[PDB]
Each structure stands twice: as C-alpha cells, then as structure tokens.
Amino acid sequence: NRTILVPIDISDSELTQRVISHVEAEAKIDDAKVHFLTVIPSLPYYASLGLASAELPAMDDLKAEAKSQLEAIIKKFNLPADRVQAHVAEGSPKDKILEMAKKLPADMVIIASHRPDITTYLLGSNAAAVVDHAECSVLVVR
Amino acid sequence: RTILVPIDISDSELTQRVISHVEAEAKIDDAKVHFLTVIPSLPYYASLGLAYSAELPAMDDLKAEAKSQLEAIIKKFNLPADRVQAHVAEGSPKDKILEMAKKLPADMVIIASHRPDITTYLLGSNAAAVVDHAECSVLVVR
Amino acid sequence: NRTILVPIDISDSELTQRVISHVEAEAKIDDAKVHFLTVIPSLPYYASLGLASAELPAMDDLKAEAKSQLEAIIKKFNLPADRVQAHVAEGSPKDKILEMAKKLPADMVIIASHRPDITTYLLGSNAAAVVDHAECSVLVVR
Amino acid sequence: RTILVPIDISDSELTQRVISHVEAEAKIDDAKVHFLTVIPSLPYYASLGLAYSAELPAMDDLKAEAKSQLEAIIKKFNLPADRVQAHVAEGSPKDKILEMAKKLPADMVIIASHRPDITTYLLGSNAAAVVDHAECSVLVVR
Numbered sequence: 001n002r003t004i005l006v007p008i009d010i011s012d013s014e015l016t017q018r019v020i021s022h023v024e025a026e027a028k029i030d031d032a033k034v035h036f037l038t039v040i041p042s043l044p045y046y047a048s049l050g051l052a053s054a055e056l057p058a059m060d061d062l063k064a065e066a067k068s069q070l071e072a073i074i075k076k077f078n079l080p081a082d083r084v085q086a087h088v089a090e091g092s093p094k095d096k097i098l099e100m101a102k103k104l105p106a107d108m109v110i111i112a113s114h115r116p117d118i119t120t121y122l123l124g125s126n127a128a129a130v131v132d133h134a135e136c137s138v139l140v141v142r
Numbered sequence: 143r144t145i146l147v148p149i150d151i152s153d154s155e156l157t158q159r160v161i162s163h164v165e166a167e168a169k170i171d172d173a174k175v176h177f178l179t180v181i182p183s184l185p186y187y188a189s190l191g192l193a194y195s196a197e198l199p200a201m202d203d204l205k206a207e208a209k210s211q212l213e214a215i216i217k218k219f220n221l222p223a224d225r226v227q228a229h230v231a232e233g234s235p236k237d238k239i240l241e242m243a244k245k246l247p248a249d250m251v252i253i254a255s256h257r258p259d260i261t262t263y264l265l266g267s268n269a270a271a272v273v274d275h276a277e278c279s280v281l282v283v284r
Numbered sequence: 285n286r287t288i289l290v291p292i293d294i295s296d297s298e299l300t301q302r303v304i305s306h307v308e309a310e311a312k313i314d315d316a317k318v319h320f321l322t323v324i325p326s327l328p329y330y331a332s333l334g335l336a337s338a339e340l341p342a343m344d345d346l347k348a349e350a351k352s353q354l355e356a357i358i359k360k361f362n363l364p365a366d367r368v369q370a371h372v373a374e375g376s377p378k379d380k381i382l383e384m385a386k387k388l389p390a391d392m393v394i395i396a397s398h399r400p401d402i403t404t405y406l407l408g409s410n411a412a413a414v415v416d417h418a419e420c421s422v423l424v425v426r
Numbered sequence: 427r428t429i430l431v432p433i434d435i436s437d438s439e440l441t442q443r444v445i446s447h448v449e450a451e452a453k454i455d456d457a458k459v460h461f462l463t464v465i466p467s468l469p470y471y472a473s474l475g476l477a478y479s480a481e482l483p484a485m486d487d488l489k490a491e492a493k494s495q496l497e498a499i500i501k502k503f504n505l506p507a508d509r510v511q512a513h514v515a516e517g518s519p520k521d522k523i524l525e526m527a528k529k530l531p532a533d534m535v536i537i538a539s540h541r542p543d544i545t546t547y548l549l550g551s552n553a554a555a556v557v558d559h560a561e562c563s564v565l566v567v568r
C-alpha cells in the first residue's frame with residue numbers, strides 16, 4: 001500500500017479545502033497511508049534581530065499548538081482513522097517536507113500550488129521546491 | 143471531468159507508473175482523457191533555412207505520422223474508447239499543452255517529470271513550464 | 285543614471301560578501317544610484333499560532349533594528365555616499381523586493397542565488413521569484 | 427575572467443540592452459567573452475524519421491551555417507578581436523550552455539530572459555534552466 005505525504009500550512013483555509021478531494025480520491029486508490037506534516041517555520045532573519053523560549057514562546061509549546069491545529073484540520077478529510085498520521089516539525093518547511101518524503105518514504109506528495117491571491121505567482125516558495133526536488137510523484141493542486 | 147495527458151512520441155516506452163496514474167485518475171471520475179502530442183517547430187531551424195514542405199516534410203504528413211504514433215501509445219492505456227481522444231498540434235510543446243489545458247478545459251494535467259534518466263529527479267523544460275503555468279492541478283509523475 | 289536595487293537579508297554574511305564586488309562594478313557603470321532593501325518577514329503561520337507589538341516586539345522597533353543592521357552592511361560596499369539609499373520594509377521579502385523594483389523603478393536587481401549549503405538547491409525562495417517576476421534585468425550572484 | 431554569452435541565431439536583432447550589458451561587463455575586467463550557439467537536436471524529429479545527413483542536412487554544414495551567422499552577430503558587439511571567441515555546438519541548448527559554462531569555466535553567463543514579446547516578462551525555457559543550474563553568476567537581461 002502506498003504512502004502519501006500531505007503538507008499542511010495551518011494558517012491556510014482555501015488551500016486545505018482544494019486538496020481534500022484530491023487527497024481522498026488518491027487514498028481510495030491502493031488504500032494508501034496518509035501522512036500529514038505541518039512545519040513551524042524558523043527564520044534566520046528573526047534570529048538576526050534577536051528574536052529567539054524567550055521573546056518567542058517555547059518550541060515544545062508551538063509544536064503542541066501546531067499539532068493541535070493539524071489534527072483539527074485532518075478531521076476535514078474522509079480517511080480511515082487507521083490510515084492517517086499527523087506530524088509536526090520545525091525549520092524550513094520545504095526542507096522538512098522533502099526530508100519527510102525521503103523518511104517515509106512517500107510515493108506521492110499532494111501540495112497546493114500557492115495561496116489564491118491577486119499577485120501573478122506561479123508556485124509558492126515551498127510548492128516549487130517540493131515539485132523540483134521530490135523524488136516521487138507530486139500532485140500540485142489548484 | 144477532463145484529464146489532459148501530453149505525450150512525446152519519442153518516449154514511447156512509457157513507465158507503468160504513468161499509465162497507472164492516468165488509468166487510476168480516470169476511474170475516480172468518469173473522466174474523458176485527452177492525449178496531445180506536439181510537433182516542435184524551432185525558429186533555429188527556420189533560421190538555418192529548414193522550412194516545412196521544402197527541406198523538412200509537409201506539416202500534414204508530419205501530423206499524420208505523429209498522430210499515428212500517438213494512437214499506438216494511447217492504446218497502452220486500459221481506457222474505454224469513448225473516454226479517450228487523440229490530438230496532434232505543432233509549435234511550442236509547452237505552449238500548445240498549456241493552450242489545450244485552457245481550451246478543453248482540463249481539470250488535471252498528468253505529465254512525466256522528465257524521461258527516465260539517472261542524472262536527475264529535476265523536471266524537464268516542458269514539465270517545469272506546465273507545472274508552473276497550468277491553471278489546473280498538475281500531477282508530475284516520477 | 286540607472287537605478288540598482290540590492291536586497292539584503294541581514295542574517296546572511298557569505299551572500300552579502302559575493303554581491304559586494306558585483307554591486308560595486310555595476311554602479312561604476314553609469315554612476316548608478318544604489319538602493320538597498322531589507323525586509324522583515326511576516327509569517328501567516330506564526331499569526332495562526334497566536335504570535336503577533338505583543339509576543340513579538342513592536343514593528344517600529346524591529347524596523348529600526350533591521351535598518352540599523354542594513355546600514356552597517358552598506359558600509360561594506362565602496363559606493364559614493366550620495367548614490368546610496370537604505371530601505372526597510374515588512375512582509376513577504378519577494379513581494380516587497382518586487383514592489384520596490386516597480387516603485388524606483390529598478391534598472392537592475394542584484395541578488396544572491398541562495399545561501400551556500402550542502403542541500404542541492406537551485407535558487408532560494410526569494411531569488412527565484414525575483415528572477416521570474418522582475419520587469420528589469422536580474423543579476424543572480426553565485 | 428570569462429563571460430559566456432549564449433546566442434540563438436534566430437534572434438539576430440539583439441537589443442542594444444543585451445549588447446550593452448556584455449560590452450560593459452567585459453570592460454570591467456579584461457574579460458574574454460565566449461559566444462555559443464547550439465543547434466537543437468530533437469528526439470521528436472528523430473522519432474518522425476528525420477535524421478541528420480538524410481532528410482535533414484549534414485551536421486557539419488549546419489554547424490558551418492550557424493557559426494557563420496554567429497560570427498555576424500558577434501561583430502555587433504564592440505569588443506577587441508583577441509577577447510572574443512565563437513562556439514557552435516549541437517544538442518540540447520540549455521545543457522550545452524551549462525556544459526560550456528562548466529568547461530571554460532564561466533565567471534558569468536549573460537542571457538536574455540526571453541525574446542521581446544509583449545505577452546510575458548517570464549523567462550524562456552533556456553534562460554530559466556541556465557539561471558537555475560549554472561554554477562556561476564547569471565545576468566538575466568530584460
């Protein structure tokens with residue numbers, strides 16, 4: 001049975017809606033195991049300003065909260081309880097997505113292109129890197 | 143529902159992986175699958191005095207030759223005859239693909255990342271452009 | 285006389301070193317005006333965790349600090365005092381870089397590709413978007 | 427110092443902007459400027475039974491024709507004869523460019539984004555690949 005990785009930005013509503021049907025259809029093929037991953041971004045820029053368990057809340061705290069929101073989001077998908085798993089990481093979202101894709105390993109990554117906006121973007125920062133560097137199939141959802 | 147599957151006739155030995163994705167996606171819905179091959183037309187060759195119906199063959203004969211090869215490829219897929227259509231175009235492959243996706247319109251484009259090649263998991267020129275510019279979901283198959 | 289935009293991530297040392305010579309050579313042509321821009325990233329993800337002049341320091345504060353570090357960095361370039369200007373913004377670095385490129389308007393953007401790392405990146409998140417969407421020439425420094 | 431300037435002979439009417447960038451970059455240093463044109467070789471055409479020295483002309487004659495056109499283009503640049511070299515290759519233009527950049531090696535590649543075209547400021551297929559994969563600095567001219 002295949003493995004599908006579904007990266008979720010917990011701050012995105014519309015994106016999460018569009019991937020739901022795709023994720024559901026994809027898992028109904030092969031009875032796939034679906035792994036959801038949300039990544040707490042860590043910015044060098046903020047570090048360089050001095051903003052660190054100090055001016056920013058504890059990482060253990062942030063993770064529990066992110067994980068909490070991810071599990072709320074996973075309830076929006078019709079997937080067998082036995083086939084789903086939630087993951088939280090910290091770092092560059094693209095690197096951690098790609099790392100998780102190597103770790104599982106993933107047969108497919110399902111990822112939204114970019115938040116809907118009035119800019120003329122192609123792919124988002126993270127979608128483009130995943131598409132480019134993943135070693136498995138990537139479904140870019142629009 | 144409409145799936146567009148671009149085919150480069152010089153990669154006739156498709157992976158089971160690509161065939162499998164298309165068959166599976168088509169089964170999810172009652173989807174029509176449109177296959178498209180594009181005869182590339184190069185300004186560089188025009189600049190060298192290589193013109194259609196002169197030192198290159200007539201475009202119509204090239205179209206028929208391409209379409210004939212596409213039809214042999216289409217049959218590799220286990221799809222009902224009434225849910226499959228063959229298209230041949232000429233020009234810039236990325237732009238004709240994107241044009242077709244817009245015309246139909248496609249709900250999904252299924253495209254191989256790159257011909258099997260041990261050097262890279264990176265996208266080829268057409269895959270990269272299609273993933274970037276399609277207005278619909280794009281599955282990049284590896 | 286032309287206008288050159290030089291985006292600076294204040295947390296990057298190596299990148300800033302490599303662009304120095306390019307920026308200097310480029311400005312010696314045309315006696316260009318050189319505008320430096322550093323952008324305080326604002327992350328939806330952090331907002332969605334609750335982290336806002338509250339759990340994160342005042343934006344006025346962050347800006348003064350970023351601007352301070354930018355001016356320290358601008359001292360590493362041999363440019364006429366009359367030809368340089370420092371800017372700070374807040375938001376998506378790529379959007380604000382691109383906006384500044386439209387606002388000046390910029391004749392050239394000089395931007396490092398990506399921090400040197402042992403990952404096999406092509407361009408960074410922001411370099412790629414600038415390259416892709418800027419309406420002027422872009423010098424991608426490596 | 428070595429500058430590589432890829433030339434597509436079917437865009438012979440270069441912008442003053444491209445010529446200006448190359449001249450200026452070469453003057454900064456005492457730089458040698460290598461110009462390269464690549465005769466594209468398409469698997470798709472091979473698949474249609476179009477082979478060199480049969481239904482296409484001999485590669486040597488195509489090489490000589492291309493080189494002759496390149497040399498006329500090279501002369502548009504105001505460069506000293508001893509700091510300029512012409513190269514013709516055959517195959518995938520993006521890969522031969524990148525190969526040349528590696529071989530020389532190039533300290534900089536100067537490349538137009540795309541032929542002048544009112545539809546887009548986005549990169550063409552070769553420019554995009556070259557900016558992404560060159561190991562050296564790349565100036566994308568618009």
Ligand SMILES: Nc1ncnc2c1ncn2[C@@H]1O[C@H](COP(=O)(O)OP(=O)(O)NP(=O)(O)O)[C@@H](O)[C@H]1O
Nearest residue numbers: 007008009038039093112114115121124125126127
């Ligand atoms: N922290 C994360 N965890 C999991 N997935 C993520 C994360 N961040 C981004 N992604 C994935 O990649 C996409 C991000 O795109 P988005 O943030 O809209 O582009 P952007 O960076 O705003 N581009 P632009 O508007 O051009 O400046 C989302 O759909 C996610 O699925």
Ligand SMILES: Nc1ncnc2c1ncn2[C@@H]1O[C@H](COP(=O)(O)OP(=O)(O)NP(=O)(O)O)[C@@H](O)[C@H]1O
Nearest residue numbers: 148149150178179180235254256257266267268269
């Ligand atoms: N003429 C065409 N008609 C239809 N589809 C095409 C055409 N050309 C390319 N494609 C699609 O896009 C993919 C081709 O990219 P590909 O040629 O494999 O890599 P590449 O450009 O050679 N890159 P590299 O070899 O890394 O330098 C194929 O799987 C096709 O689905």
Ligand SMILES: Nc1ncnc2c1ncn2[C@@H]1O[C@H](COP(=O)(O)OP(=O)(O)NP(=O)(O)O)[C@@H](O)[C@H]1O
Nearest residue numbers: 291292293322323377396398399405408409410411
């Ligand atoms: N806040 C900013 N202000 C100004 N310029 C910026 C800013 N952020 C990024 N840039 C520019 O774009 C580059 C960012 O690349 P970088 O952060 O190394 O890639 P990345 O996102 O870590 N990629 P990866 O390692 O593949 O996950 C820098 O050289 C800057 O010049």
Ligand SMILES: Nc1ncnc2c1ncn2[C@@H]1O[C@H](COP(=O)(O)OP(=O)(O)NP(=O)(O)O)[C@@H](O)[C@H]1O
Nearest residue numbers: 432433434462463464519538540541550551552553
């Ligand atoms: N055969 C070649 N030899 C040398 N350089 C080349 C060659 N082909 C392309 N290039 C370089 O890359 C640029 C070409 O990209 P271009 O063909 O203008 O856009 P495109 O691929 O047609 N994209 P679009 O028209 O947007 O769908 C040129 O300025 C050249 O410098």
Ligand SMILES: [Mg+2]
Nearest residue numbers: 009124125126
């Ligand atoms: Mg994002």
Ligand SMILES: [Mg+2]
Nearest residue numbers: 150266267268
């Ligand atoms: Mg190809």
Ligand SMILES: [Mg+2]
Nearest residue numbers: 293408409410
């Ligand atoms: Mg960065």
Ligand SMILES: [Mg+2]
Nearest residue numbers: 434550551552
């Ligand atoms: Mg071209």
